[PDB]
Amino acid sequence: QKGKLIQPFGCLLALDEKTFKVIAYSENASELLTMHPVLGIGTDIRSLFTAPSASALQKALGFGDVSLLNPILVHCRTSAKPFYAIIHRVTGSIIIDFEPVKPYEVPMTAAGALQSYKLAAKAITRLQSLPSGSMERLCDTMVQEVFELTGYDRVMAYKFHEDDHGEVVSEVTKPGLEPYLGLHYPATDIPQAARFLFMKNKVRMIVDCNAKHARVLQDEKLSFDLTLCGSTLRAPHSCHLQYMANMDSIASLVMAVVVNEEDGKRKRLWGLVVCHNTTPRFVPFPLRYACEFLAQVFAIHVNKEVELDNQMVEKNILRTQTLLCDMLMRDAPLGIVSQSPNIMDLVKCDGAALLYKDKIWKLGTTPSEFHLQEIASWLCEYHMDSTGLSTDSLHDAGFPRALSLGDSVCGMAAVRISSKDMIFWFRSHTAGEVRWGGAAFLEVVKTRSLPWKDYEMDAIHSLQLILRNAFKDSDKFTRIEGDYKAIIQNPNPLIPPIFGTDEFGWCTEWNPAMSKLTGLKREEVIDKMLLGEVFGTQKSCCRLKNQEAFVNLGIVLNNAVTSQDPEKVSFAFFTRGGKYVECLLCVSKKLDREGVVTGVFCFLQLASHELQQALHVQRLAERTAVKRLKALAYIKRQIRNPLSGIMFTRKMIEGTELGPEQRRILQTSALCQKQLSKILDDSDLESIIEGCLDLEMKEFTLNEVLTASTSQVMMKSNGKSVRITNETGEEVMSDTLYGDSIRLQQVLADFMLMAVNFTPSGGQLTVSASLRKANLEIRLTHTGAGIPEFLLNQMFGTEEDVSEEGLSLMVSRKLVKLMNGDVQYLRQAGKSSFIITAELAA
Amino acid sequence: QKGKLIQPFGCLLALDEKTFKVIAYSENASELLTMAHPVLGIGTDIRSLFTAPSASALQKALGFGDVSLLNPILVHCRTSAKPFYAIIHRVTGSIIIDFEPVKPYEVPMTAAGALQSYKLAAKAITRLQSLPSGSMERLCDTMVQEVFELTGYDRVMAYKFHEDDHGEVVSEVTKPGLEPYLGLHYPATDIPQAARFLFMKNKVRMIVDCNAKHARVLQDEKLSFDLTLCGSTLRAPHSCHLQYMANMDSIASLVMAVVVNEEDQKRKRLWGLVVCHNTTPRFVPFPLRYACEFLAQVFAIHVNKEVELDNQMVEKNILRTQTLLCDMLMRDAPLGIVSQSPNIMDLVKCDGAALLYKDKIWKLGTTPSEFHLQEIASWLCEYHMDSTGLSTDSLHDAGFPRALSLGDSVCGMAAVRISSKDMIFWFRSHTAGEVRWGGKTRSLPWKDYEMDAIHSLQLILRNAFKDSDKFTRIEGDYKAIIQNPNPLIPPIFGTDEFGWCTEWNPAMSKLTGLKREEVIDKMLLGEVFGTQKSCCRLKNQEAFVNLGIVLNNAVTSQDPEKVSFAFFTRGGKYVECLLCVSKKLDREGVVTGVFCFLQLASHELQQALHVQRLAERTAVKRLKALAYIKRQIRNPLSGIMFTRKMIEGTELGPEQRRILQTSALCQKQLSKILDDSDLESIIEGCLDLEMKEFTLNEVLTASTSQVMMKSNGKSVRITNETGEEVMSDTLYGDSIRLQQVLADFMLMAVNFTPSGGQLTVSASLNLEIRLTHTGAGIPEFLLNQMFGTEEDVSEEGLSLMVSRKLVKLMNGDVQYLRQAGKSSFIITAELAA
């Protein structure tokens, strides 16, 4: 922080807060500024520059927060050399850094901050337009935009893990360089001092490494040593220089990403965005400022997308709760595997087994009954005081016959239902490969399975509890997964609140979870009418807020009596003492064995507010989507009807004898109607955009296509008085082609109709076709300026969304791509040419 | 309320709260319950006239806490069978038990409690719940239709109370052959306030027969207080309802009550009644009455919801007026607003705009003559000295000397003075007003926020001119009710290109608590709006970054955008609103900063737009796919049109010409149906119809050509038997939509028909078209879908619903008639010949 060496592309001056006189100066500063006022201790600052520059600098030092006006434009007194001045406040002193102003780009008058921030107005918009839910897309977009703005050769999205070991997540380099994606790096490349330094100043630049750095002339009479930690000209340290030495890079630009995560707010370094170049380069301060702002935006976005993945766990927990509630109705024996929701959906796995009275059931990939007997015997004999176990890899646990099992089963999770009854879940082997570069060593994770999370064990234990209670009517788990001997622990049940009533309305079920959630003892509440006594506005144990809640509860119960499916509704009630519980009620029928309705069975689902709002938004979106789909189907039918009408009328007209030229005109109309029926037959363009398509195989000739297109277009062409000519040879005509004719006619007609529309009044258009032995090349040459550049760019498929005409162009290009061809646009003096390539069978 | 007379269809008993002995009774009880026994006298026990389980149930009910839960207690008499309901009420110092006979023709023990009783109305509640919001008349008509279907009474009416207690019939449903009173107002004296309070206390009242003889109640003389039968369901009318029934020609009555909770606990007001009248005596079981009482609660909830939605719509409208009141400071000179398209005609709802400025008169829309405007200004400057504005909806009543000569084209005038010579007029048009009572143009009166908007426009224009209070008396039949409208100018702050503050209007000073002098000449980011050492403290980093982003985007982009904003003021109050930004382009065309204003929005409205925007962001491709399809429609249509032209380009015969013209008719049909989607055409004003000459022969031929294909597919023959006299006659009206309607009607007739069936077409001229097809006929549930009874509609039924609504737009109805092997579709409409 006190290294007295600075880079030579700029100069530094350290002054006092009160005297405004130069104390610390650099050797190159005297040369650059005086290129006469001798730069030295006790010299003023105004005389080195002109009067307006001195006034601006003095006002800047007089400001409260100089960081808002950091890039200042100043002029040297002699020859008016432009310079960028940056002000920074060290304890008891002001440090100003001056850099030369190359032509480059200049903001309006003084750059300030907002104008500099304006330089990154496109990358911010592109980042804010991405659909949420995919961190990799965000990383790729940020890296690409940083590459575009900075212009450095290589851009990397180095990421920090919990053990501070790096992992590149993306990279975009110029062609002709070694990719670095996926290469892990050790924790000694970046010392913790570097991270601490980056936590303070977010952007660091090293313009060149093999350059002689000047020194400073810090005053001897100063009572404190100057700190160069905050200055942007501080010379790189040897340890940091070793990084570029091992990375064969010269110019570096490192931008920290700082997120704010709530205390378990505390700051955290999500990673870095590193830029490298093989040759030295320098960029103006506004570009660095804009890059820092863009990094702030990216940090905000990543912090937002972490919270969205924090909700998938809650959603899966709710789904498991629903499954557990559903499974409570089935009979204890064989009811575990009776219907579609078996114990495969309880925890993610590929094999399940239920040992009960020597009747081993199989549900998938699982060892033989012999091997299952052996593993059950081993678990019984070794782990006496273990109701349940979860082994990551059976080899590590110590199963003698784990070798004979093979690679099919690796992880195991077993529970003891009763003295002789047990349940097993098995997981197949997954191998992990980590490049682990910058070290390269290639570590192996041996034969291990995916870890068993907490809520999976919680669900398994809840299932065990349910089965034990059901069997009775008719707790420490050893987790040897980290090869750290026994880490036995106690899980928690995952039973949601439940209450059930008979047909009349008297309470009959009140489980301990509800007793804890409400605070009401079951003995206190049972044998009381559900509507009016347990839940009621006045004179009731649990006080509903309004009369609307009472009406809604009554409606929900009455509707649920009729319908078997469990409707999800909102619920809100006060507890015994002044607490407003807001949950999501689910009611289901209670059909008995014979099939007589006995009552209702209800359970709540406690959920955070964001999840409920997301569910509401999803419901609204699906309703809007179904309405739009119904409207589109209605329109399609109402257009299909007159389509059939005109088909039949054309058939009737063809029934009467007419001229051979009339016959040709009728045939051209027939091709037009077939094209119309085909385009109306398409369900939507989204399937075309996705890529899933089929092209029919049929015989055709070019005369039909050309005549259909000309008949389609020439009315509009003559609207602008446009001449159309055909130069295709008759030999190419006589040749017959094979493929999908309708797509070709529609695509070529659209392209050449756009050419007609772009044709100025009185222009000329020529159509030619060439057959090479087969390949067909189509040239459409129209007189005029042609399509503008932006529309030509919109024609390409790189853009996600374009104009309607641009969308038609993109769809035609995609169809040509599926037609193993290409589309080219050529501009010449007063001419524009479309070239279309196709490959078919002759 | 203390009347000792009861209706004869039930019986009454009274029990002491503690001793549980009978103290009052009725002769109907003597003739109905103990008939074949203990004497029904004072002090007689209760557990002797019923079976032991019945006595146990009665004892348990009496010992219960809240008896009003399990009211319809079915009880078996001591004699064999003879069921009876046992409704119970707790009155001061007694418990009153009413028995009503259970007729076994219906309801064989289908309800024994409140929860089971409420089940009978599940279908009605489901139908009411899923209706789209924003239409009171639809809710009322559905509600009364459901009442009619559930109860089966002859006449059902929704009777809405106004502020002056005088009622208005909003809807009504009756069996055919009955005189309607729809829309007829009634005096407030028909229903006394005592009846209103009684309805507020007892939600449902039933009078089975007005002519039935009432029976007395024998009560002990030893009690110190008389028994009150006000809460009992067995009470006799006190001649107040007898006269009402005689006047309305009714014999039986079932009258409910609608109670709505309105904010100042919130008060409860009787929004109206749902009255059922019958010409013959009728009896409904207690569960049906109990369910009809439950339906009223859902109806009241929905009515309150619709009222809140209307209030939010009003707030959105005033927000829009506030937004459009801006963009007039930017425009230079008074002529600038007149020249531009969003003119002063859009500031307030008017049919004519006039501006008098320096001997120049600028007029827009329906406006009087120049001499008329000059004489209006002369009158206003000659009779009104100190006024800054005038307002009236009837200029004739205003006292204009030549108001009658001005005609009915313009009636209401609102005028505001800008300078000593320049001033502004807003004029309205003719409105139709009819009021009925069961016992020169008037235009809608000017509201208050309209006056506020006009006053703020006056302030803006006078400020701009300088840079270069007023009485309404027509809302009532009075004179010179002076008012002082307040302005509607939103808070405004504006900065230059560097970021320093430049303009900070007083509204922002009031809202945020700061002052103009202490904030001016400071950077907008960091100094004013900042997380630290700032006047207005932002919440966290995200707000700062978002504000910077929106400022930069506003500078770069060209259109205003709305972004949520939230900050702490200097007094600790958390303000949340919407921020709108715009570029402050100079006359030359170079940006010189930004101009921003806040739109303080209500919490419900603000949160009703976040979810809307979030849902909008989900659908992107499908929104523009419709426009893409609409634009790409033209090319195949142009191709088919030009192919038709070339087909015409040679020699043709008579039949060939006819079939070509039929094809062309279908061609225009396809063109105009693909040109516009028309959405649902819910409003009759929308979907303007082309009206041109046509003949019926072409229409019929074009309609049957589209379906001959399917007819020959099933080998179904179609015959047209309309006479040549009707065919030769020419009508002036819409044709092609009639072609489509006829075509899809015969298409549906072909569907669901056996092969070899006969289809017959007839027309009578009022145009009536009858299409009779032989076979089994269309299934009933399809007709239920097409009539709108079933909310869920199939794709095939949607076309029939569209055709029915189109026929209704032609002021007609579609009729389905069923006979042995015959189904007849009758379409009726009118045109000009």
Side-chain angles (χ1 to χ4, degrees), chain A residues 59 63-65 68-69 108-110 113-115 117-118 121 124-125 128 260 265 293 296-297 300 304 503-506 529 531-533 539 547-548 551-552 554-555 557-559 561 617 620-621 624-626 628-630 632-635 637-639 641-646 648-649 651-653 656 658 662 665-666 668-669 672-673 675-676 679 684-686 710-716 750 753 800-801 804-805 807-808 811, chain B residues 60 64-66 69-70 112 115-116 118-119 122 125-126 129 294 297-298 301 497-500 523 525-527 533 541-542 545-546 548-549 551-553 555-556 591 611 614-615 618-629 631-632 634-636 638-643 645-648 650-652 655-656 659-660 662-663 666 669-670 673-674 677 679 705-706 708-709 740 744 747-748 751 793 795-796 798-799 802 805:
Chain A
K59 187 218 164 313
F63 203 77
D65 276 347
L68 284 188
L69 311 93
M108 306 106 94
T109 315
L114 211 45
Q115 309 203 17
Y117 284 145
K118 195 142 51 173
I124 289 166
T125 303
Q128 286 188 322
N260 291 354
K265 306 185 182 181
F293 191 73
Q296 284 194 8
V297 156
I300 277 189
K304 181 186 301 309
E503 198 158 12
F504 293 105
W506 315 101
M529 196 142 200
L531 278 172
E533 293 230 14
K539 183 250 186 204
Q547 186 85 3
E548 188 179 356
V551 176
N552 281 319
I555 295 168
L557 283 187
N558 278 350
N559 280 3
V561 154
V617 167
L620 257 68
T624 295
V626 72
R628 194 84 40 74
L629 211 156
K630 190 67 62 183
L632 184 60
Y634 164 41
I635 285 193
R637 168 64 136 70
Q638 271 282 2
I639 302 315
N641 260 345
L643 187 143
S644 51
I646 177 64
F648 165 67
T649 317
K651 289 174 187 178
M652 167 75 158
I653 295 185
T656 317
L658 288 170
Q662 195 102 35
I665 298 183
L666 282 184
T668 305
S669 172
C672 299
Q673 310 155 58
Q675 171 178 332
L676 175 53
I679 178 160
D684 216 11
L685 301 164
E686 300 161 344
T710 36
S711 300
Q712 175 162 354
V713 306
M714 72 76 88
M715 162 154 155
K716 202 162 193 187
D750 200 349
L753 178 87
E800 286 194 11
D801 203 342
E804 312 164 12
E805 315 71 44
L807 175 55
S808 159
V811 163
Chain B
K60 170 187 177 179
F64 201 40
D66 201 12
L69 297 166
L70 54 155
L115 194 39
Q116 304 201 32
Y118 288 151
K119 200 187 293 180
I125 303 154
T126 296
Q129 275 197 356
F294 188 74
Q297 294 172 20
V298 175
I301 283 168
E497 68 273 63
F498 269 42
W500 311 94
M523 218 144 184
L525 283 168
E527 287 274 55
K533 175 272 291 183
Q541 199 78 19
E542 183 175 4
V545 171
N546 279 330
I549 288 176
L551 283 192
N552 288 165
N553 282 5
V555 159
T556 57
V591 304
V611 291
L614 268 190
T618 302
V620 172
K621 302 295 183 177
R622 299 184 70 189
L623 187 61
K624 294 98 185 174
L626 181 56
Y628 164 89
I629 289 290
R631 200 150 191 174
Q632 291 284 337
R634 179 76 169 194
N635 323 322
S638 72
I640 198 68
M641 255 154 205
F642 167 70
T643 50
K645 286 187 180 181
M646 311 275 258
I647 291 164
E648 169 62 77
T650 73
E651 297 182 353
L652 307 159
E655 185 82 11
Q656 283 71 254
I659 51 188
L660 258 171
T662 306
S663 65
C666 299
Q669 181 186 340
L670 182 53
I673 186 52
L674 249 196
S677 305
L679 268 303
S705 45
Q706 317 179 192
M708 268 168 216
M709 164 29 49
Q740 166 189 345
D744 74 9
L747 176 64
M748 201 46 38
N751 292 313
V793 185
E795 303 173 6
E796 318 70 10
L798 191 47
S799 64
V802 162
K805 85 168 193 280

Side-chain angles (χ1 to χ4, degrees), chain B residues 155-305:
Chain B
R155 165 167 328 260
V156 286
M157 323 160 28
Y159 190 102
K160 168 184 179 189
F161 282 176
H162 281 285
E163 310 279 357
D164 48 339
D165 281 325
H166 101 276
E168 175 187 351
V169 176
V170 182
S171 186
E172 182 211 351
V173 161
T174 45
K175 275 185 183 166
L178 298 178
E179 175 178 8
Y181 325 84
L182 201 154
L184 286 171
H185 296 212
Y186 293 85
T189 89
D190 272 356
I191 295 207
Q193 192 187 7
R196 271 171 185 77
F197 196 87
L198 193 67
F199 277 115
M200 262 185 168
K201 177 217 310 183
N202 305 342
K203 294 234 191 305
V204 173
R205 181 153 152 77
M206 184 195 59
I207 298 168
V208 54
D209 196 358
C210 35
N211 306 309
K213 196 169 83 51
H214 312 99
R216 61 199 279 98
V217 168
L218 306 181
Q219 152 195 359
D220 193 1
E221 296 183 348
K222 298 176 183 173
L223 319 88
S224 59
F225 69 99
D226 270 320
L227 282 188
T228 311
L229 309 192
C230 72
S232 166
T233 180
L234 282 170
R235 212 182 75 258
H238 47 288
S239 182
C240 177
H241 264 260
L242 277 182
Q243 55 99 58
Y244 191 73
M245 281 175 118
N247 293 353
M248 302 270 255
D249 205 13
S250 49
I251 299 303
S253 167
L254 169 72
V255 49
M256 306 187 354
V258 181
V259 179
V260 185
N261 285 44
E262 58 97 24
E263 316 190 321
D264 284 312
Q265 279 183 288
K266 307 182 178 199
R267 324 281 311 300
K268 42 191 286 186
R269 62 184 292 265
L270 199 145
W271 175 95
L273 279 75
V274 178
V275 187
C276 312
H277 283 162
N278 198 1
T279 63
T280 68
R282 178 171 170 77
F283 176 76
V284 279
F286 196 96
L288 203 41
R289 300 209 302 271
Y290 209 176
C292 276
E293 180 188 349
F294 188 74
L295 187 43
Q297 294 172 20
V298 175
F299 187 60
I301 283 168
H302 267 86
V303 156
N304 202 352
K305 187 180 178 193

